UniProtKB/Swiss-Prot annotation:
pH dependence (UniProt free text): Optimum pH is 4.2.
Protein name, as recorded: Thiosulfate dehydrogenase
Organism from which the protein derives: Allochromatium vinosum (strain ATCC 17899 / DSM 180 / NBRC 103801 / NCIMB 10441 / D) (Chromatium vinosum)
Lineage, broadest ranks: Bacteria, Pseudomonadati, Pseudomonadota, Gammaproteobacteria, Chromatiales
EC id: 1.8.2.2
PTM field: Binds 2 heme c groups covalently per subunit.
A Pfam family recorded for this sequence: Cytochrome_CBB3
Length: 230
């Protein structure tokens, strides 16, 4: 692997590319408001691909976009063939955002690509960045949703809600996003898989330490709930 670094915003180039990168960041951080025709729920890309300092997709083990562009095209078992990054983005509009894929030459899509390419600056094509993806956590027993419910009430509810519906900010964006129900990710999302949810939770939640057993069980509880069908 090569190490994960984030380029400096102050070194963004003047011109069409620089303007595209800035728009891309906003599409990824504020997706439902910026692309209403394509987003079917309350999630922005940043809700599973967080970043520091206003950026999106810069955190190890939370599927960073740093270095993503050099890994496509690649085989997708979902598709049964090689796909491009444009297509991959569409898949998460359809699944995690319960919406519709953008046309493959849509200017918003190209702006998102430009932002991902900027984050990937300096990464050798083909190289794998340390911390890419969301490493799974898998335990050798069933997730205990009773334990999970108790953990949820004690460790998660204050942000994500008794009903899993999250907490809105003053501008109508989710400060703390919905974990289940009609505004959350659909059943086609990667986050709907036990080992992926458990892995994400293990490394990233509660925001700002859970044991493996705790992450596994609370992921189990979260995933017992209804969400939109894909
Ligand atoms: C208690 C252990 C939990 C569990 C099971 C989850 N969270 Fe959170 N969460 C918070 C914020 C701001 C985000 C967005 C991403 C970020 O900026 O880091 C998240 C994201 C999640 C997700 C993915 C998104 C989704 O809607 O599904 C999941 C699965 C998730 N969380 C589970 C904020 C908070 C908190 C506020 C301080 C606390 C506490 C938690 N989360 C705790 C948990
Ligand atoms: C949680 C509900 C998610 C939301 C909202 C979005 N994405 Fe996502 N994404 C998610 C997971 C669990 C994964 C798998 C990580 C792994 O281990 O590979 C992904 C993956 C991607 C990828 C591929 C990354 C790679 O390294 O190959 C891309 C390009 C991607 N996601 C883009 C993306 C965009 C543009 C989103 C807003 C439309 C978005 N995702 C939302 C979980 C979630
Ligand atoms: S995604």
């Amino acid at each position: 692997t090569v190490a994960l670094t984030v380029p400096a915003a102050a070194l963004l180039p003047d011109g069409a590319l620089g303007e595209s990168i800035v728009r891309g960041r906003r599409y990824l951080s504020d997706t439902p408001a910026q692309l209403p025709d394509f987003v079917g729920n309350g999630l922005a890309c940043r809700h599973c691909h967080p970043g520091r300092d206003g950026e999106v997709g810069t955190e190890a083990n939370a599927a960073p976009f740093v270095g993503v562009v050099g890994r496509f095209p690649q085989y997708s078992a979902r598709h049964g063939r090689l796909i491009t990054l444009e297509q991959r983005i569409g898949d998460c509009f359809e699944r995690s955002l319960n919406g519709r894929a953008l046309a493959l030459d849509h200017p918003a899509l190209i702006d998102m690509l430009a932002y991902m390419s900027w984050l990937s600056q300096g990464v050798p094509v083909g190289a794998v960045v340390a911390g890419h993806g969301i490493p799974t956590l898998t335990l050798e027993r069933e997730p205990d949703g009773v334990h999970g419910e108790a953990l949820y009430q004690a460790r998660c509810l204050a942000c994500h809600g008794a009903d899993g519906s999250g907490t809105l900010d003053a501008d109508g964006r989710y400060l703390f996003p919905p974990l289940w129900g009609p505004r959350s990710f659909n059943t086609g999302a990667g986050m709907n898989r036990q080992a992926t949810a458990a892995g994400f939770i293990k490394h990233k939640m509660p925001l700002g330490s859970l044991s493996d057993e705790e992450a596994w069980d609370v992921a189990g509880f979260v995933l017992t709930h209804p969400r939109p069908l894909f």
